[PDB]
Design a protein around this ligand. Structure first.
Ligand SMILES: C[C@H]1O[C@@H](n2cnc3c(N)ncnc32)[C@H](O)[C@@H]1O
Ligand code: SF4
Lengths: 158, 123, 444
């Protein structure tokens, strides 16, 4: 997907237990500064499907990362001047699993990627992932002839 | 003791062979875990606190290491031991947060009621 | 833990020796030209593996996936699985069916979706539910240089040949279709390619009497032609629609009583050398189907009890492991000559309690054989399997430390080469090895 003018982010996945995210800046002729900057751990088996959600809030959107350990781990990508500053002397016992990845693309666009949610179930491997055009649901298809919609309900959060 | 008698004297013996010091304490019948977990906290150069605690929690049960890391009054060390302990993070992490913001002498009473050191708590 | 054994069956087909002989084997039951409904060759359709195949309609992606996750609903917690193929003459099938069969065997573990045989095994190398080997059974006239390197591309490491007799008249009169001097020549090209060769033997065949059975198996381990790494003892069962059923009908073939047969296999296991294993003493056929032959389904323990009061202990490498703690262990090796090459058998043993810890096979590559391109530019030595049971951890790296020191000095080799399976290719990459085709080798 894109962020705000020309800067893109690509999300690589396959054959291992991690998720790779790269970045590159566009130009009049081609692209440049194409390098791998993140390395997302958390999974237990291969990553079969992953997709971006559309940027509803300007500067804040989500990321689904489905995998072959029957889990559908989510991510969350924020923008400049909204980084959720941390690691200060009044630290919050950051629970190193939520270690809040951070990088720069060139110099003037820097992001923060943290962990959001984690869902069990699905009874088998999951195949395909889909978001919605407007609302905040998520479709998942598995390998045991099942198809279920996931939704964040109120008064619970999860 | 005799192994520790030589490679706790030179400054360069505890550089290369710092990992076998962890086994030399933790293999005793008094089970001197409090001196192994003391020299880990002084390791300031790199991430070698991670590589040593993952070796100390293999040859010993992890909650035995967790209760001993909790006893020498430094709470940032007890955090790294608990994440290796297959425990529910909603239990220990809130307990570790209440211990962080208090005063130091306020902490050393709160830390001893958990363990059973009632006389040491009372001081 | 352990190793998960998932058994699949290929498409029900006809053997390829029905054309020029006129029919299949005399004792073989089942198949398409029989009365059992929709059954693979040498099966009846009433077996617990052969009932999972018919419900799956022999679809390899759905037959294997239903078997794997069944074994973890019981809760075996599988992460190392070894496939074995059975039924028919799998290498007699057409070439565009065999390669697509093996591809979907790998896709049931990795999750890759494709049809290229050269690319599916690369995805399967970094799998986490990993394959340590594929066993494919075949006939001795289907182990030529065209067929042996097709199995290397498939990921096969162990292959099984039905020998079933060491006499020339028995392989002729039972319409077997080959000669016994031909199977002792194809053992040599198979063991020099790096395969664990297992053969099948059948007592109580027609025209081989009681006394000829015991000099049949004494020759099998004394002669350096055969001396294989495994056996499956399959006593002859008379089935309903077979060829030997009419010999039972007209009174021209009768079987053994079940007191002399258990006496026989109590003597066969006494001669088993410590480098071979006995996988089966009988096969899984439900006894309502069988008319004559073996009465019950407990011939294994009745044979171990019959040699209790003879003083003789079966020194079998399937029997002599942990299944009793060692507290100590020694390093011994054994050296025998098998069909063209110098085999050695390294192991860790206890001579008192008679229990094994680990084992290893190694072979000097001969000069009359070994057509492979990687094993011709210099003198090489081939390690054939490593198999460690279960500190009790460093037994793998000790057997690889010793098999390499013995190859440079005593063999005089410039390269050592492993026939590791696809899922365990990464265990050898840490030890300094590099892949070159089917093999995981290293210049010495
Ligand atoms: C395919 C495998 O089945 C075995 N086999 C074939 N027919 C019989 C029988 N009647 N009894 C026992 N084993 C048999 C063969 O020996 C071969 O190894
Ligand atoms: S024995 Fe092997 S070959 Fe002879 S018929 Fe039965 S299966 Fe076909």
């Amino acid at each position: 997907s894109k962020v705000e003018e020309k800067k893109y982010l690509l999300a690589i996945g396959g054959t291992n237990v991690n998720v790779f995210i790269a970045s590159f800046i566009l130009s009049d002729s081609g692209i440049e500064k194409c390098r791998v900057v993140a390395e997302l751990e958390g999974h237990e088996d291969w990553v079969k499907s992953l997709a971006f959600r559309h940027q509803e809030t300007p500067g804040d959107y989500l990321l689904c990362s489905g995998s072959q350990d029957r889990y559908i781990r989510l991510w969350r990508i924020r923008i400049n001047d909204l980084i959720d500053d941390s690691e200060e002397d009044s630290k919050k016992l950051t629970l190193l699993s939520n270690k809040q990845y951070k990088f720069q693309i060139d110099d003037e666009l820097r992001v923060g990627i943290n962990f959001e949610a984690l869902i069990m179930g699905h009874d088998d491997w999951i195949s395909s992932l889909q978001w919605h055009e407007s609302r905040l649901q998520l479709l998942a298809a598995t390998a045991d002839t099942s198809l279920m919609v996931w939704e964040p309900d109120e008064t619970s959060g999860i | 003791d005799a192994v520790l008698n030589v490679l706790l004297s030179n400054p360069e013996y505890k550089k290369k062979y710092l990992q076998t010091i962890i086994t030399a304490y933790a293999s005793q019948n008094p089970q001197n875990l409090s001196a192994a977990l003391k020299l880990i906290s002084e390791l300031e150069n790199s991430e070698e606190k991670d590589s040593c605690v993952t070796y100390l929690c293999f040859l010993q049960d992890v909650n035995v290491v967790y209760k001993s890391a909790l006893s020498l009054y430094d709470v940032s060390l007890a955090l790294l031991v608990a994440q290796k302990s297959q425990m529910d993070p909603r239990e220990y992490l809130p307990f570790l947060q209440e211990l962080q913001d208090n005063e130091p002498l306020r902490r050393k009473f709160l830390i001893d009621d958990y363990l059973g050191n009632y006389e040491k708590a009372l001081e | 833990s352990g190793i998960a054994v998932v058994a699949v069956m290929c498409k029900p087909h006809r053997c390829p020796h029905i054309a020029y002989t006129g029919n299949i084997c005399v004792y073989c039951p089942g198949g398409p030209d029989s009365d059992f409904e929709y059954s693979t060759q040498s099966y009846t359709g009433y077996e617990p593996t052969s009932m999972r195949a018919i419900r799956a309609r022999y679809d390899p992606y759905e037959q294997a996936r239903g078997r794997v996750e069944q074994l973890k609903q019981l809760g075996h917690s599988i992460d190392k699985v070894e496939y074995v193929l059975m039924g028919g003459t799998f290498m007699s099938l057409p070439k565009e069916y065999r390669e697509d069969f093996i591809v979907k065997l790998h896709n049931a573990l990795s999750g890759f979706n494709g049809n290229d045989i050269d690319e599916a095994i690369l995805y399967s190398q970094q799998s986490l539910t990993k394959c340590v080997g594929i066993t494919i059974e075949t006939r001795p006239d289907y182990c030529t240089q065209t067929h042996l390197d097709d199995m290397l591309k498939y990921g096969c490491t162990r292959l099984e040949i039905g020998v079933q007799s060491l006499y020339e008249d028995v392989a002729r009169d039972t319409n077997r279709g080959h000669t016994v001097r031909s199977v002792c020549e194809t053992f040599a090209v198979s063991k020099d390619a790096g395969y664990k060769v297992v053969s099948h033997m059948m007592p109580d065949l027609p025209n081989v009497g009681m006394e000829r059975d015991i000099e049949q198996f004494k020759e099998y381990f004394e002669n350096p032609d055969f001396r294989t790494d495994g056996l499956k003892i399959y006593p002859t069962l008379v089935i309903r629609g077979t060829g030997l059923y009419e010999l039972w009908k007209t009174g021209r073939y009768k079987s053994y009583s079940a007191n002399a047969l258990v006496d026989l296999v109590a003597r066969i296991l006494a001669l088993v050398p410590p480098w071979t294993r006995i996988y089966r003493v009988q096969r899984d056929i439900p006894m309502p189907l069988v008319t004559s032959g073996v009465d019950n389904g407990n011939l294994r323990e009745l044979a171990l009890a019959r040699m209790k009061d003879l003083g003789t202990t079966c020194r079998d490498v399937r029997t002599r492991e942990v299944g009793v703690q060692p507290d100590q262990v020694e390093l011994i090796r054994r050296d025998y000559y098998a069909n063209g090459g110098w085999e050695t058998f390294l192991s860790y043993e206890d001579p008192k309690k008679d229990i094994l810890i680990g084992l290893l096979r190694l072979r000097k590559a001969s000069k009359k054989y070994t057509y492979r391109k990687e094993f011709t530019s210099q003198r090489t030595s081939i390690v054939r399997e490593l198999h460690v049971y279960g500190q009790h951890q460093g037994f793998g790296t000790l057997l690889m430390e010793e098999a390499e020191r013995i190859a440079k000095e005593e063999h005089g080799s410039e390269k050592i080469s492993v026939i590791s399976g696809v899922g365990v290719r990464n265990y050898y990459g840490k030890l300094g090895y590099e892949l070159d085709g089917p093999y995981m080798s290293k210049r010495i």
